[PDB]
Design a protein around this ligand. Structure first.
Ligand code: ZN
Ligand code: ZN
Ligand code: ZN
Lengths: 237, 77, 105, 161, 81, 231, 332, 99
RNA sequence: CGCUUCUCGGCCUUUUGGCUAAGAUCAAGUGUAGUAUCUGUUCUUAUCAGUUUAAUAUCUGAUGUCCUCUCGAGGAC
């Protein structure tokens, strides 16, 4: 239906009947969507799967999804990645339980040849990190950030913008000390494509959390005609 | 819409799985994502139509010819 | 919004007048362009609430029918502190669709 | 200080070779040159160690290591010249046997100590098939009548089976 | 060309909107001086770092605050050219 | 002329390694920076993470990776305990012509974390096939190495003789590694091991004529509780 | 390991203090802001002991705090400018014993930032307008008006941004029901940034500049700027309108200067020094805190100097023009 | 018009299915009709279409015929073994180089 | 032992029930933004100088002095 209210209501009803009966029957039919006419959508089916997994707790569906990730067809691999994205955005705080499960998947996406898998995997990390804010699951977010970082040199606007979003999510979830350590060596690189990318990232940080960044800057030695070291910070008591 | 489209795509795919077998085509591979790869050229092809059109190319043919001459010279009471 | 990068926001000082959305657009966050977890209300620039524009859909430009909210994310990263998000460019999409309309029927 | 690794079992990974050489010395260059067509090992490889004594030590310590069970020949990168030996010691094995007997030449075959079937001890004899008649001759020349570990060694060209 | 000058306008405007961001030709001097000046505003903010300095030296918090705000003018020596 | 003026004053890689306190840190391209000194100093700080390697590679990132075939993603073993692999296969196969307590326990009762790289682990093309090296540790072994030797793998490997332990006891341990202790050669035979010549013997302890070991010791002659733990 | 954090005795050092009739009745109480705890004391009038009427935790750094009270109102509110993004107005309900949050208006991101306001807070004596200012580049003004039910109401923010300008202290000037003026010490580092020699670091003296609301046109204009002789660190309002002249006292290193706009000339004094001190002679002397006492008859200020000597400052005036300033020692 | 991809799919489809069910074939590619497939195959694709330049004798025959049987190209083109399109344009070309 | 024919065992090939009117029949949404892949097509110039780049590249420009042979050549320099 070329209208949106229709599709909306459709998805919500899919949630309702899932509650009526039980996730497995509806999830199996929803997964059978390779539905070539990609957007205009199988995307809305992705949303539907998310609501399914949400309304009846995702114990049930997450194995089914992680299974489907094997079927070698493209649009369905990407379907499962999107559905993950929405899943984490919707359930929010509960990801503290499934993040350990999910990562080795996302690892697998972030390390492969094509931009659609990397752009959609980066959306996932954004939402996931925003949901896990403050619960102590940082080691795995840090590992996912290590795979995400190298795409930072890229061109297609959709992937470059998905990556930047992911990076600021990870900023709130890892801290800015981390993003700063990642962002240092290239603030002053000899290139200029990199210096562009790095100063864009470092601004997007500095705008947020420009206060937290105080206790994080590296110590920089002073030269002959200036004084670059802050001594008030090591007044020892 | 989807039932006929799915049948259409499936029929096309089976169609040059049969044609690739009939031309005993070595440099053919289907990858895990269902796209078509030329192992001789390291090129990805989306459709079965795209893959057959790639086989008639200055790229494919020159790679086939270079692979050819090199192979021939490269053998030994 | 995150979908047409050719769009612009007012970006002056927020005020005290709440923001409203058309029935068409309603149900979403203005920036993260999602559809969930509304947390906090929108506030708009004094100009962007002056004049006939009392009660207009920030995005669609149409009639105010409900309040406009901020997703949990945007309020967690504090993207909700950039003043009027009122979009001061109409955008190509509405123009072109109306024009093709007038052509066809 | 480069090492010839021949007889390497087709399934042995050059990674596994460098892995065994990790405990063995300064593993500097592991390279299993292979037929670029079939991909599997070409039965030859070159492993250069940074130190010459470590290279020779790996050659002398990795001797006959059973690669996929098959003894691979690691050293620097059957013509009827086999010695047989009488008065062989029962506590000697092929390891020390070839280790000392390598002096007169490279050994073409595994030194077989004549051992009986029931308990498994030596019947008092050994043999090994060297490379050349000169090698078997210098072996039987330094090793005949002389004292082996606890039994006075006896070396003569082996009787053909 | 177009990239350089539109990103240049965007960086000059984003910077004049946020004091202290950077752009691909930011020099060591401007980086370091913006970074001092922020340290200073933050010492005067956090009610406590003020106590730390006002005990490490033996001055009183009013005199300490005054010296900080004196320095915020040119903290890392005079400019470089 | 100004570009040329900076070029004229530009440093060599040797000069940049020279004045700078740390010279390795210094790459061939750092000489092209605006400030060589600040850049090397920033690459010489602790915990920083170096720029990804493919900035200069003329070719694309994972586009260059391309051509070889990859096996489909392998499920975490605890999801694999549910068997949803089998249920999906059966339904799919019928079309081609599960209980809930196990799933809840699989997610909570028996789900465990994977192996994850700490901060500074960048991904690069080949890191999944990069050969883990540097492991100069003689004690570490494999199961593929043990089996392809014909040596036992698993908990008995310690009593399963490495075929070069007899050459360790014969020429000394590998001479490049004096620091090598071999159990049953320079440390005692492991628990329940027996020196001997039968199938599975540890040889004879390396010995001098007064009764002391020439290599190691062939016979083997705080309060670490954590603070706040759950009960 | 999982941890749970409690306190045992709350903070007890005091960083700001204001005094009002916060509970509505003639008895007058103190609000003190500890670091991140805000608590209201009241000193019992006969015996003099002080009681901690209430202490609440605010989980946020309190950077400034002011009392203020509408025209003819009999309560006093509490403006609090935190490190958050928001200005908030509180009021102490004596009945239920708790601070109620009458108002909260957001204007920027959170944390002790450089250009996001909150540090300096000023109010105009007759209660009409509060201004909240950063340390650089941003100042806001809100107007507060009683509604129908005479409950409080807050305007939308006005704006006074001005690039490259530090601000050493902001204070409202007292005028009777005219345009409100705020008089903020300043300094302009912009050219000192581009003096490769190092001159404009010196020979750049700070300029006192009266901003001014404009009730008619509803904005905020810089009315008068004027250089100061030497750097001063804070301002004391001088009760204007009917009682006393108007104007501000500047308390700069070694001097104190009345200086008001109009035609009033500037008036100075050097700060009286300890008879035969031991201090290192070079170290100057400044005023740390200060406190106005104002009675239906008179007014006088107390100001305290670095070593801890109070001084009772008074102003001798000719009906509208102040002629002389007179300090005498008080105590230590 | 036709693109080489549609062209190849046509080759394969024909050699599999035989020349008689054009409905199935045209069902395969999108934006292609059975009538068009039939036409294209018999016109250009089919191997029997001889693709070379005109002999002198072939042009003699062509010219002579198109003089004998005005404007009947679907009558001529079998007699010289090319399509109506070939005969047509090529006769145009001879006529233009003459004048 | 040589020849020839036949019997069998080990087995490396194709292998839908037909007639009828080729039984009959034979679907594509639209727009706006951006990326990817194929097919296609093309650089041998020598310096120098410049531009530009992280570095190439690119792009820009010109081909020691005198005579003469036909960018080459000989000699007095
Ligand atoms: Zn949002
Ligand atoms: Zn506005
Ligand atoms: Zn709308």
């Amino acid at each position: 239906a070329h209208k949106k209210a229709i599709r909306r209501a459709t998805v919500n009803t899919f949630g309702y009947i899932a509650k009526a009966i039980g996730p497995h029957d509806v999830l199996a039919t929803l997964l059978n969507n390779l539905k070539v006419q990609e957007r205009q959508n199988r995307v809305c089916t992705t949303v539907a799967i998310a609501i399914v997994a949400e309304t009846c707790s995702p114990f049930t569906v997450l194995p089914a999804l992680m299974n489907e990730y094997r079927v070698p067809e493209l649009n369905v691999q990407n379907g499962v990645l999107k559905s993950l994205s929405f899943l984490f955005e919707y359930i929010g705080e509960m990801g503290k339980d499934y993040i350990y499960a999910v990562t080795p998947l996302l690892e697998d996406a972030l390390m492969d040849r094509d931009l659609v898998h990397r752009q959609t995997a980066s959306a996932v990390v954004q939402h996931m990190s925003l949901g896990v804010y403050g619960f102590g699951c940082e080691d795995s977010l840090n590992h996912l950030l290590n795979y995400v970082w190298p795409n930072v040199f890229e061109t297609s606007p959709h992937v470059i913008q998905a990556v930047m979003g992911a990076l600021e999510g990870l900023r709130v979830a890892i801290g800015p000390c981390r993003m700063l350590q990642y962002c240092l060596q290239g603030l002053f690189h000899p290139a200029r494509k990199v210096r562009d990318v790095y100063w864009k990232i470092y601004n997007s940080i500095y705008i947020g959390s420009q206060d937290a960044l105080i206790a994080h800057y590296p110590r920089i030695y002073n030269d002959d005609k200036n004084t670059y070291i802050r001594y008030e910070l090591d007044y020892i008591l | 819409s989807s039932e006929s489209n799915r049948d259409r795509r499936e029929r096309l795919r089976q169609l040059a799985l049969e044609t690739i077998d009939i031309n005993k085509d070595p440099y053919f591979m289907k990858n895990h994502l269902g796209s078509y790869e030329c192992k001789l050229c390291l090129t990805l092809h989306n459709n079965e139509g795209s893959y057959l059109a790639h086989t008639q190319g200055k790229k494919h043919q020159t790679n086939l010819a270079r692979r050819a001459a090199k192979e021939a010279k490269e053998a030994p009471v | 919004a995150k979908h047409h990068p050719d769009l612009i926001f007012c970006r002056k000082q927020a005020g005290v007048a709440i923001g409203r959305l058309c029935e068409k657009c309603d149900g979403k966050c203005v920036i993260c362009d999602s559809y969930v977890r509304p947390c906090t209300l929108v506030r708009i620039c004094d100009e962007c609430n002056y004049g006939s524009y009392q009660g207009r859909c920030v995005i669609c430009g149409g009639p105010g029918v409900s309040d406009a909210y901020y997703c949990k994310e945007c309020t967690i990263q504090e993207k909700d502190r950039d003043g009027c998000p009122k979009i001061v460019n109409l955008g190509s999409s509405k123009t072109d669709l109306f024009y093709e309309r007038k052509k066809y029927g | 200080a480069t090492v010839y690794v021949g007889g390497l079992d087709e399934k042995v990974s050059e990674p596994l070779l460098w892995e065994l050489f990790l405990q063995a010395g300064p593993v500097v260059n592991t390279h299993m040159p292979k037929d670029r067509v079939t991909g599997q090992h070409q039965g030859y490889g070159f492993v250069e160690f940074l130190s010459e004594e470590d290279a020779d030590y790996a050659i002398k310590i990795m001797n006959m290591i059973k690669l996929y069970g098959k003894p691979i020949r690691v050293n620097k990168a059957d013509v009827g010249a086999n010695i047989f030996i009488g008065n062989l010691d029962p506590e000697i094995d092929e390891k020390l046997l070839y280790d000392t007997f390598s002096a007169f030449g490279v050994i073409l075959q595994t030194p077989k100590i004549m051992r009986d079937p029931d308990t498994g001890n030596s019947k008092g004899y050994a043999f090994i098939n060297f490379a050349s008649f000169d090698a078997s001759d210098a072996a039987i020349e330094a090793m005949n009548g002389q004292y082996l570990c606890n039994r006075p060694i006896t070396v003569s060209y082996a009787f053909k089976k | 060309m177009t990239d350089r000058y539109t990103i240049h306008s965007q960086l000059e405007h984003l910077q004049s909107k946020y004091i202290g961001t950077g752009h691909a030709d930011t020099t060591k001097w401007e980086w370091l001086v913006n970074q001092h000046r922020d340290s200073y505003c933050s010492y005067m903010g956090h009610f406590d770092l003020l106590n730390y300095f006002a005990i490490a030296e033996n001055e009183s918090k009013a005199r300490v605050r005054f010296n900080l705000m004196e320095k915020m003018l040119q903290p890392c020596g005079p400019p470089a050219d | 002329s100004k570009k040329k003026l900076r070029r004229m004053n530009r440093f060599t890689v040797a000069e940049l390694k020279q004045l700078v306190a740390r010279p390795d840190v210094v790459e061939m391209h750092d000489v092209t920076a605006q400030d060589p000194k600040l850049l090397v100093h920033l690459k010489a700080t602790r915990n920083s993470v170096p720029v990804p390697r493919h900035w200069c590679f003329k070719r694309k990132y994972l586009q260059g990776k391309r051509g070889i075939e990859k096996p489909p993603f392998e499920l975490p073993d605890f999801i694999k305990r549910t068997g949803i692999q089998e249920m999906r296969e059966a339904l799919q196969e019928k079309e081609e012509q599960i209980d809930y307590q196990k799933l809840h326990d699989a997610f909570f009762k028996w789900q465990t974390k994977p192996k994850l790289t700490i901060h500074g682990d960048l991904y690069y093309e080949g890191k999944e096939f990069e050969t883990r090296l540097k492991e100069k540790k003689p004690g570490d072994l494999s199961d593929e190495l043990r089996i392809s030797l014909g040596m036992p793998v698993g908990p008995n490997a310690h009593k399963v003789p490495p075929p070069w332990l007899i050459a360790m006891q014969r020429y000394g341990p590998p001479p490049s590694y004096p620091n090598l202790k071999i159990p049953g050669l320079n440390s005692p035979i492991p628990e329940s091991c027996s020196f001997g010549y039968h199938a599975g013997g540890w040889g004879k302890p390396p010995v001098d004529e007064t009764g002391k070991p020439l290599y190691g010791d062939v016979f083997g002659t705080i309060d670490r509780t954590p603070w706040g733990e759950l009960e | 390991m999982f941890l749970y954090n409690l306190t045992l005795q709350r903070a007890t050092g005091i960083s700001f203090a204001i005094h009002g009739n916060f509970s509505g009745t003639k008895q007058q109480e103190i609000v003190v802001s500890r670091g991140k705890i805000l608590e209201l004391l009241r000193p019992d009038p006969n015996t003099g002991k002080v009681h901690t009427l209430l202490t609440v935790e605010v989980f946020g750094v309190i950077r400034s705090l002011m009392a203020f009270r509408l025209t003819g109102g009999t309560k006093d509110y509490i403006v609090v400018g935190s490190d958050s993004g928001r200005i908030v107005i509180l009021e102490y309900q004596p009945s239920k014993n708790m601070f109620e949050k009458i108002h909260q208006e957001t204007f920027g991101k959170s944390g002790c930032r450089r250009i996001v306001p909150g540090q300096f807070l000023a109010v105009d004596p007759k209660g009409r307008a509060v201004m909240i200012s950063a340390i650089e580049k941003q100042k806001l003004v809100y107007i507060l008006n009683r509604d129908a039910a005479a409950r409080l109401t807050i305007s939308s923010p006005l704006e006074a941004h001005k690039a490259n300008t530090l601000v050493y202290h902001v204070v409202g000037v007292d005028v009777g029901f005219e345009n409100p003026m705020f008089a903020c010490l300043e300094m302009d580092y912009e050219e000192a940034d581009n003096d490769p020699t190092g001159e404009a670091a010196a020979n750049t003296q700070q300029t006192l500049t009266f901003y001014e609301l404009d009730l008619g046109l509803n904005h905020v204009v810089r009315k008068y700027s004027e250089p100061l002789e030497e750097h001063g660190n804070f301002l004391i309002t001088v009760p204007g309108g009917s009682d006393g002249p108007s104007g501000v006292l500047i308390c700069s290193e070694n001097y104190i200067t009345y200086k008001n706009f109009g035609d009033q000339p500037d008036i100075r004094c050097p700060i009286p020094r300890r008879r035969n001190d031991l201090d290192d002679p070079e170290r100057g002397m400044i005023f740390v805190c200060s406190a106005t006492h104002k009675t239906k008859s008179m007014f006088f200020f107390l100001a305290q100097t670095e070593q801890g000597d109070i001084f009772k400052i008074t102003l001798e005036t000719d009906e509208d023009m102040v002629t002389e300033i007179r300090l005498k020692y008080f105590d230590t | 018009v036709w693109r080489n991809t549609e062209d190849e799919i046509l080759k394969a489809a024909v050699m599999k299915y035989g020349k008689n069910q054009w409905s199935r074939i045209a069902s395969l590619l999108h934006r292609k009709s059975a009538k068009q497939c039939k036409a294209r195959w018999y016109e250009w694709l089919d191997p029997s279409i001889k693709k070379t330049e005109w002999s002198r004798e072939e042009e003699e025959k062509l010219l002579h015929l198109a003089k004998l049987m005005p404007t009947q190209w679907r009558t001529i083109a079998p007699i010289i073994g090319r399509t109506a399109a070939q005969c047509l344009e090529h006769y145009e070309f001879l006529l233009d180089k003459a004048a």
